[PDB]
Each structure stands twice: as structure tokens, then as C-alpha cells.
Amino acid sequence: LAAALMQAL
């Protein structure tokens, strides 16, 4: 999940 959200950066 972390990667799924951190793609924003």
C-alpha cells in the first residue's frame, strides 16, 4: 500500500 500511495511523489 505504501508504494501505491507514494507514487504521488
Please, which experimental method was used?
Answer: X-ray
The span from the CA of 1 to the CA of 9, in Å, is: 14
CB-based contacts of 5: which residues, under 8 Å, 6+ apart?
Answer: none
Burial letters 1-9, b for 16+ CB under 10 A, else e: eeeeeeeee
**DSSP states along 1-9:** -HHHHHTT-
